[PDB]
Design a protein around this ligand. Structure first.
Ligand SMILES: Cc1nc([C@@H](NC(=O)c2ccc(-c3ccc(Cl)cc3)[nH]2)[C@H]2CCCCN2)sc1CO
Ligand SMILES: *[C@@H]1O[C@H](CO)[C@@H](O)[C@H](O)[C@H]1NC(C)=O
Ligand SMILES: *[C@@H]1O[C@H](CO)[C@@H](O)[C@H](O)[C@H]1NC(C)=O
Ligand SMILES: *[C@@H]1O[C@H](CO)[C@@H](O)[C@H](O)[C@H]1NC(C)=O
Ligand SMILES: *[C@@H]1O[C@H](CO)[C@@H](O)[C@H](O)[C@H]1NC(C)=O
Ligand SMILES: *[C@@H]1O[C@H](CO)[C@@H](O)[C@H](O)[C@H]1NC(C)=O
Ligand SMILES: *[C@@H]1O[C@H](CO)[C@@H](O)[C@H](O)[C@H]1NC(C)=O
Ligand SMILES: *[C@@H]1O[C@H](CO)[C@@H](O)[C@H](O)[C@H]1NC(C)=O
Ligand SMILES: *[C@@H]1O[C@H](CO)[C@@H](O)[C@H](O)[C@H]1NC(C)=O
Ligand SMILES: *[C@@H]1O[C@H](CO)[C@@H](O)[C@H](O)[C@H]1NC(C)=O
Length: 339
């Protein structure tokens, strides 16, 4: 006795009110305390359809992250709507915390428990929950960081796998640590991410093998981004308030597809805002060692559509649509109004 519907969700977290960290600060006034003992009810013989690509939960999380970033990450110079704006741009404490999304009274969240669910279609194993799992609003491109892993086999997620214009979401089942560091001491913007080539090249081959199963045994080739802004041509992310730009060619160039893979990184001040508000400029990198060790739990790829009768299918690290990042975690939920 329920139907698919959209409504105003609310967030919950374990943020500290005393902290100056931006995520904790935002969650303190925007979210409520997390439920100590949340309940989950498995619906008997209930089957439901899901669509991670058409989920209002994604838009709502998007609006929250945009709100947090607009309040916390303000640039020195801004350019939006043909208006140059100067303002204060002090360094901040930045480190994403788990955010839960819940439904109000008269509404519930359906959770797909199919251990091989790809994001779209029917789900045989469904359960009822008030909130989602703790999701860190990590903004990045190409690589999904600090997210959840696929329980069983690797999963390929796409709204339309044949459409080369539709982005693909790779859900890894084994995290590959990416250790990025801007050493205390030849540019201050020069950084690097270390990835164990053995762990990575093994996972990438598995990703290569499963893609073949989706494209009828066609040859899978990984190549660097064909073009576009640096935000999508390179693995971009925020580390301690700094915008890291790392070349991932050594990751997506077929050589071992065995030691330490060192990716060249740049800490850029001039950036294109993912909010779509234009470009912005921030102050130089902070002093001391800047380190961010993350778990590579997902991969954003874009397939070339210049091959019809060929025996090859080329894939490149894509993204840009940050809403895809929320989709990689909000694929297994959907809001329904109880009747
Ligand atoms: C109106 C509009 N213009 C956009 C340009 N792309 C970006 O602004 C962008 C993508 C990724 C990031 C980024 C930055 C920092 C971090 Cl830490 C992580 C990610 N910024 C497109 C527009 C078309 C030519 C190519 N660029 S997107 C957009 C909708 O929001
Ligand atoms: C359904 O999902 C729940 C939670 O993930 C799990 O405990 C249960 O074993 C699943 N049922 C089947 C038949 O796999
Ligand atoms: C990464 O995953 C490991 C387990 O493989 C875990 O111990 C660690 O806390 C994770 N780090 C994150 C999520 O930042
Ligand atoms: C991850 O999935 C692949 C199939 O894509 C499988 O071969 C591998 O064993 C899985 N890893 C784990 C830890 O289950
Ligand atoms: C996802 O699963 C549904 C249902 O099995 C199927 O119709 C769809 O083609 C699948 N898509 C991908 C990308 O696997
Ligand atoms: C998926 O993309 C292909 C390629 O453009 C297209 O022919 C097909 O109609 C698309 N599927 C849907 C359901 O629109
Ligand atoms: C990351 O790499 C640095 C070297 O720049 C090293 O000192 C540090 O211990 C590494 N961290 C992890 C978690 O491996
Ligand atoms: C990354 O480096 C490779 C080789 O060093 C180069 O071919 C490629 O163009 C670089 N990518 C970007 C986005 O600069
Ligand atoms: C990569 O992982 C293996 C274990 O799988 C380990 O023995 C090796 O030392 C790691 N590489 C580096 C550079 O530490
Ligand atoms: C992932 O989590 C770890 C531990 O909280 C943190 O040090 C790291 O900066 C996070 N990665 C990103 C990209 O925020």
């Amino acid at each position: 006795v329920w139907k698919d519907a959209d409504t105003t969700l609310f967030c919950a977290s374990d943020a500290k009110a005393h902290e100056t960290e931006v995520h904790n600060v935002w969650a303190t006034h925007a979210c409520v305390p997390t439920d100590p003992n949340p309940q989950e009810i498995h619906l008997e013989n209930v089957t439901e359809n899901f669509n991670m690509w058409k989920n209002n939960m994604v838009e709502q999380m998007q609006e929250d992250v945009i709100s947090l970033w607009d309040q916390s990450l303000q640039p020195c110079v801004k350019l939006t709507g043909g208006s140059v704006i100067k303002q204060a741009c002090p360094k901040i404490s930045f480190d994403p915390i788990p955010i839960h999304y819940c439904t109000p009274a008269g509404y519930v969240i359906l959770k797909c428990n199919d251990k091989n669910f790809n994001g779209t279609g029917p789900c045989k194993n469904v359960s009822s929950v008030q909130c989602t799992h703790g999701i860190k609003p990590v903004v990045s491109t190409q690589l999904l960081l600090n997210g959840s892993l696929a329980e069983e086999e690797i999963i390929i997620r796409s709204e339309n796998l044949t459409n080369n214009a539709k982005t693909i979401i790779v859900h890894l089942n084994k995290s590959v640590e990416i250790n990025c560091t801007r050493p205390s001491n030849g540019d201050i913007r020069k950084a690097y991410c270390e990835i164990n080539g053995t762990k990575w090249n093994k996972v990438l081959k598995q990703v290569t093998e499963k893609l073949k199963e989706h494209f009828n045994n066609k040859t899978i080739i990984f190549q660097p981004p064909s073009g576009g802004d640096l935000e999508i041509t390179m693995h971009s992310f925020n580390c301690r308030g700094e915008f890291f730009y790392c070349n991932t060619t050594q990751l997506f160039n077929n050589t071992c597809i065995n030691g330490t893979i060192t990716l060249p990184c740049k800490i850029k001040q001039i950036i294109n805002m993912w909010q779509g508000t234009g470009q912005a400029m921030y102050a130089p990198p902070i002093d001391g060692k800047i380190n961010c060790v993350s778990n590579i739990t997902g991969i954003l790829l874009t397939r070339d559509g210049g091959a019809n009768n060929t025996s090859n299918e080329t894939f490149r690290p894509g993204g840009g649509n940050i809403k895809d990042n929320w989709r990689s975690e909000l694929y297994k939920y959907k809001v329904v109004q109880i009747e």
